[PDB]
């Protein structure tokens, strides 16, 4: 549990990642709790977190794309 544990699950097991989980996540404030960590971290665990961040980043992107498509085809929809 904690701030980064949401990123941990992202890089090993994104089953526990809701849409709202992805949305809720502040990537910037997370790479910050990676770069200045509570206790300097093994090069292994840094590499994992790195992936998790990019996972969430990717899903955010995926969702936004989905939504911009729906929104656009909603518009020319309403032209007739």
């Amino acid at each position: 549990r904690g701030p980064l544990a949401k990123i941990w699950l992202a890089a090993h097991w994104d089953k526990k990642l809701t849409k709202a989980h992805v949305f809720e996540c502040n990537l910037e404030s997370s790479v910050e709790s990676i770069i200045s960590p509570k206790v300097k971290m093994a090069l292994r665990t840094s590499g994992h977190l790195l992936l998790g961040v990019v996972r969430i980043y990717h899903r955010k992107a995926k969702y936004l794309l989905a939504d911009c498509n729906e929104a656009f085809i909603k518009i020319k929809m309403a032209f007739r």
Partner: protein
């Protein structure tokens, strides 16, 4: 997180079904004569959890069924039931039932009775902090010598892999493949917002004409769409912000990199002594770096050190054992499996280990086998393996009876 219970059927020498009485969360020791089913039991668990067993040529797979007397054994399974009371596994259950079943064609994992992929189970275990970059969650006599009789060069390659270097280079490279796949989405996004922005522009003008004098829906909805485009914008800004602070991560990692590798190195060294100085009291030992090219060992059992090759029999083994124990302190795990590790050392040291496990097992679970009574002192539950008409049986025994089968 610990192994609450193990259940085996049809695996190597355990032909009939075996519901092994639930483990202590501390140290459970397993005794039995040679060729009664000890190593076979650890294999059943390595079968469910170890990386080296995830990929099995079918010849390898069939090796694991039970060839014996009765009807032709046709499938095996090993269900490991973890206690998850500290939610270390990312599953909202207090127990988790991992089980692998096996057959001529089938090789299938089940997670709380639901099919999962080997790659799932790998991810699941990695997530609980079981790194495949770490070969020492299970320790056999094999891996003690492989360590003891190892070149200082290969001993480097080991630590680099444990420290990170491989998993880092592997994720680091894995991440970029994502981000370049993302760009195509990001641009496909930015495009849409421009297309949408034009239809808003268009509506603006049609909605001006009619006011100053193309379905009514669009006109009706024009406010909502406008509101909606600024909703998406703020999300797009989140990405363009986020993208920046990932590059700022990737660089800090390529720089704290070597600091972090040697960060790891120093810590194992530090643990190396502490463990050895504790097992052999009055002794002292440290690690050393050659040319970077390799990592060697210099040990003093009282300071008149000697190289790794320049050591004895049950001395090379014990030294290499400490090295492992140190690597463990420097990346611990909820439980460990030890298949006869005390064998190669004399009873004065045999106790010195057993003594250390007493301390260790207040904070992790150990499942271990032995022939020597030293580590029976270190145990909390006692299992007897018994071969009998070509098939093994496991049973809870009392520590009195345990000093029997030794």
């Amino acid at each position: 997180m610990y192994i609450k219970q193990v259940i085996i059927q049809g695996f190597r020498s355990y032909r009939d079904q075996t519901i092994v009485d639930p483990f202590s969360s501390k140290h459970n020791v397993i005794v039995g004569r040679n060729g009664s089913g000890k190593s076979n039991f650890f294999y059943a668990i390595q079968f469910v959890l170890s990386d080296e067993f995830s990929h099995l040529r079918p010849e390898q797979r069939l090796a694991l069924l039970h060839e014996g007397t009765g009807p032709r054994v046709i499938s095996a399974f090993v269900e490991i039931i973890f206690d998850n009371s500290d939610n270390r596994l990312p599953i909202d259950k207090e127990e988790v039932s991992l089980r692998r079943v096996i057959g001529a064609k089938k090789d299938q994992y089940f997670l709380d009775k639901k099919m999962v992929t080997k790659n799932d189970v790998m991810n699941l275990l990695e997530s609980a902090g079981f790194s495949r970059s770490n070969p020492y969650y299970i320790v056999k006599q094999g891996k003690i010598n492989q360590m003891a009789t190892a070149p200082d060069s290969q001993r480097l390659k080991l630590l680099r892999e444990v420290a990170g270097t491989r998993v880092y280079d592997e994720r680091k490279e894995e991440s970029i493949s994502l981000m370049k796949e993302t760009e195509g989405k990001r641009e496909k996004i930015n495009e849409l917002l421009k297309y949408i922005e034009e239809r808003l522009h268009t509506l603006e003008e049609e909605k001006e004409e009619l006011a100053g004098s193309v379905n009514k829906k669009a006109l009706d909805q024009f406010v909502n769409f406008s509101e909606q485009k600024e909703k998406l914008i703020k999300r797009q800004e989140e990405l363009d912000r986020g993208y920046k602070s990932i590059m700022e991560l990737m660089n800090v990692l390529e720089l704290r990199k070597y600091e972090a590798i040697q960060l790891t190195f120093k810590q194992v060294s530090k643990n190396f002594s502490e463990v050895f100085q504790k097992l052999v009291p009055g002794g002292k030992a440290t690690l050393v770096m050659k040319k970077f090219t390799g990592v060697g060992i210099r040990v003093s059992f009282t300071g008149e050190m000697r190289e790794m090759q320049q050591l004895s029999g049950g001395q090379k083994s014990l030294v290499a054992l400490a090295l492992i124990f140190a690597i463990q302190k420097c990346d611990p795990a909820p439980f460990y499996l030890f298949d006869e590790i005390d064998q190669a050392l004399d009873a004065q040291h045999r106790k010195a280990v057993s003594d250390m496990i007493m301390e260790l097992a207040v904070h992790a679970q150990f499942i271990t086998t032995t022939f020597r009574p030293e580590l029976l002192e270190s145990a909390d539950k006692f299992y007897g393996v018994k071969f009998r008409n070509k098939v093994s049986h496991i049973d809870v025994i009392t520590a009195e009876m345990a000093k029997d089968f030794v």
